Amino acid sequence: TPEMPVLENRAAQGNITAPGGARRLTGDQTAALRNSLSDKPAKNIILLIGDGMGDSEITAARNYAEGAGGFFKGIDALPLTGQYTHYALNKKTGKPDYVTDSAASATAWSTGVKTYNGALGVDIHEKDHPTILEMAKAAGLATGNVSTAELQDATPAALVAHVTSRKCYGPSATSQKCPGNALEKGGKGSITEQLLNARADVTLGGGAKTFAETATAGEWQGKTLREEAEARGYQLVSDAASLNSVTEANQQKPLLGLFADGNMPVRWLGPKATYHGNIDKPAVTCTPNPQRNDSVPTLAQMTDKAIELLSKNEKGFFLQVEGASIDKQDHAANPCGQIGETVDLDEAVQRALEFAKKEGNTLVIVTADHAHASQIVAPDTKAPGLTQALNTKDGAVMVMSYGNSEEDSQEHTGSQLRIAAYGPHAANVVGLTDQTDLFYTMKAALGLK
Amino acid sequence: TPEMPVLENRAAQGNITAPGGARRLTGDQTAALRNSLSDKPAKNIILLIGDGMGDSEITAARNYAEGAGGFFKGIDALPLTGQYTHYALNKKTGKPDYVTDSAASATAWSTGVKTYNGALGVDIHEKDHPTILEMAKAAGLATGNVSTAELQDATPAALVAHVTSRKCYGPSATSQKCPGNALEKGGKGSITEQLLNARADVTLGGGAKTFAETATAGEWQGKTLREEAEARGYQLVSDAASLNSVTEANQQKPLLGLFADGNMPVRWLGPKATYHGNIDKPAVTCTPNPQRNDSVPTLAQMTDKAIELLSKNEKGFFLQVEGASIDKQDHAANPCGQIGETVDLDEAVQRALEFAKKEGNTLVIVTADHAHASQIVAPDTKAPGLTQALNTKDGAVMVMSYGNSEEDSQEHTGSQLRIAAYGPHAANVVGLTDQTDLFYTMKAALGLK
Ligand SMILES: [Mg+2]
Ligand SMILES: [Mg+2]
Numbered sequence A, B: 001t002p003e004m005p006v007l008e009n010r011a012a013q014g015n016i017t018a019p020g021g022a023r024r025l026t027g028d029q030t031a032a033l034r035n036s037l038s039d040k041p042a043k044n045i046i047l048l049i050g051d052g053m054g055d056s057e058i059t060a061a062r063n064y065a066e067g068a069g070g071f072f073k074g075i076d077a078l079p080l081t082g083q084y085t086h087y088a089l090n091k092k093t094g095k096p097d098y099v100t101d102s103a104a105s106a107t108a109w110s111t112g113v114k115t116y117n118g119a120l121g122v123d124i125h126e127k128d129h130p131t132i133l134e135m136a137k138a139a140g141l142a143t144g145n146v147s148t149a150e151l152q153d154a155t156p157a158a159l160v161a162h163v164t165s166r167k168c169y170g171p172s173a174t175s176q177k178c179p180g181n182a183l184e185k186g187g188k189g190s191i192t193e194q195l196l197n198a199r200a201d202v203t204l205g206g207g208a209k210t211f212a213e214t215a216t217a218g219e220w221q222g223k224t225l226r227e228e229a230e231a232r233g234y235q236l237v238s239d240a241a242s243l244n245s246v247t248e249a250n251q252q253k254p255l256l257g258l259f260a261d262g263n264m265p266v267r268w269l270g271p272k273a274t275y276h277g278n279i280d281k282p283a284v285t286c287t288p289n290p291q292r293n294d295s296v297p298t299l300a301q302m303t304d305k306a307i308e309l310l311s312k313n314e315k316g317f318f319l320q321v322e323g324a325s326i327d328k329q330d331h332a333a334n335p336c337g338q339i340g341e342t343v344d345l346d347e348a349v350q351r352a353l354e355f356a357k358k359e360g361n362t363l364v365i366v367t368a369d370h371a372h373a374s375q376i377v378a379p380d381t382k383a384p385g386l387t388q389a390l391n392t393k394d395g396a397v398m399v400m401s402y403g404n405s406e407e408d409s410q411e412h413t414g415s416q417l418r419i420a421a422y423g424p425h426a427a428n429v430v431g432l433t434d435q436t437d438l439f440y441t442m443k444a445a446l447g448l449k
């Protein structure tokens, strides 16, 4: 009557003020850990990435949304945890670059090779290396690529595209920045063109804008990328209703969902942190974003439809799910935007876990590309950076600080960070590992090669 | 019987520029993990604490001393890992206070009750709670308390004292700061007097200064703390020569080593970080402190002796080792000092792991009280705080940034952080747990009733 348990409840068990009340455990965990260890092969894999979602980000989001002694039913629920490194390389020297971007990190987990900041699917010598999606596909597995960002963004693009710079979104930018990759130059194509060739079964996100560009060469020269996708038999959907109307997605009729021109709308609204924000302004309470929609699918919905479609495959499936805007809102120094996308991702993880639990042969991994700027500090802190006071679920104030940049955007940080997993082969995330180890873990799990 | 392994080598496997070159794993971990899970009783527990050592501090030290792709033979070797929370409580409201001090967090793990910032061994109503060392002693176990800080400091003090404020070092301050704890007003005494009453087998650290104080009352009034110590039978030692000469350590001959007036000397020196210091000044290489001596025992030496004296006890032991100055040097915004003390701890952890691996019935836990300010950022970073560039073991540049305060000292942060363990009951550290579970976990392991 086996089955691998998920963490059902790790909230504070009683009165936070009393002896034993703040305890998240209720008894010895040994037995439960043992039950969590299997080396059986995995049929499927669900990789959920919170971009910029390091330990700090998780904590701030839990404190705010669930209270300090709360528990994220999705994020905190994975039983096997570790900490991994995500350094990148200096292109010229080949030595470590301690603070990676999304492009180099995404490449790392999806290819198993370290690269330079800005590179997608290539190494420091600019050699193309096959990705876990292409490999899964090659072996006959269904494949999914879902994200809240523009599909040309680095995170999802890493799986289907090989370009020297993350910026070559479409023909236009490619010609000018990735001369080596430009179609009209003998190259493989811009990110959007490779994504279309890649042909995963299910791809959903934003970035409808770039599809308005036309190809400078080949069979579809002069037609728009959107027209191209139609001409090659993709099913195009652009709202919740039409998405939910899809019945099957495969190699004959691959799904392509374009839910916004750029990035998909953020779940919550609030003002930006500000200088001495926590002393000069009252505490903030985030509010749902009215532009979020009933016509716009949530991450959990996209995730849910994808598992549905992909699960038809007898052989199994690979699916990557990105909660994109945790990072984008961290850059913007917007606590509410940031937290709100963490809560969003947790909902997506709950869905993956519900599936995995009942299916029994699925590995579900939750992690991030790199760490980010936000820090939880004392309410009376006086910082030279940006700050904001928030009213949390506990009814107490929490102060959030962004102090690693004097200009435009807050930056990434190089701290090692959480990786949690559940299912067959989950054990490979425990202890210290490298981002590149995840590639090999997934490969091995899926039994590829 | 397949008795439990420590991670052997989690360094990058080969050439980090090549496929699979940065991998830390040489194969599937499932079997090894199974071998690591044991719910047999623990005979001994060694708890190592890096004050302010969040994942961030560990990463920087790693990059620095061992390279991005290196491995800490001590710190990174514990196979069972998780993340834990350490929020404190608001004294008046009892709602969470997101950022803890060393007093409140130390109280959490040593008594299993949350408390307010500044409290030592009391709850928000100011009532006492038995500490883990007190419970071990009651059971007839040998007990040790080692710090590189002054013994009065919060981390080591939380084990032996119950005062309303951490400032109540000795006679003088207590009278004025913790009236209800003052001896003259019938309290249990200042921290130092309370430490004396506690009578741990082995106590080593700095903090001699306060031992120069004269008691205001009791059977040793007018006499100094040091004189009282001698009168009570403690064996004093104030240098390394005399420490090694010690052969016995028990209840009627407790060891008390006072190796400094205040805190023991830090291993490494370097300039403090400065405004735009990564842009404005050359990269730094840390210098070994020439004033650290062959006369002053290192943490690993302190730990080594402690383990030896204590192990003579047939009943088992409880030992707490603190690498104190990580925190203090973080506050000071001194990368070299911060990193040097993490390297120091790592050395003490190795000593602990060595013993444990051989003995087979010892739980070893490595963690921190709370997170801190330091972040690793990109080399070209223009930040509003204090920054510095360092020359790592890789021959590359790493920049650390301090930007959560404009005031005197960098501040603590409330991010959840790594806890890692080896041995019997180590499984209770995996996943999400609270700083309060630690108490309960060590108490159940030793089967303290
Ligand atoms: Mg991203
Ligand atoms: Mg301390």
Ligand SMILES: [Zn+2]
Binding pocket: A051, A052, A101, A102, A327, A369, A370
């Ligand atoms: Zn990112």
Ligand SMILES: [Zn+2]
Binding pocket: A052, A102, A327, A328, A331, A412
């Ligand atoms: Zn980013």
Ligand SMILES: [Zn+2]
Binding pocket: B051, B052, B101, B102, B327, B369, B370
């Ligand atoms: Zn501390």
Ligand SMILES: [Zn+2]
Binding pocket: B052, B102, B327, B328, B331, B412
């Ligand atoms: Zn501190």
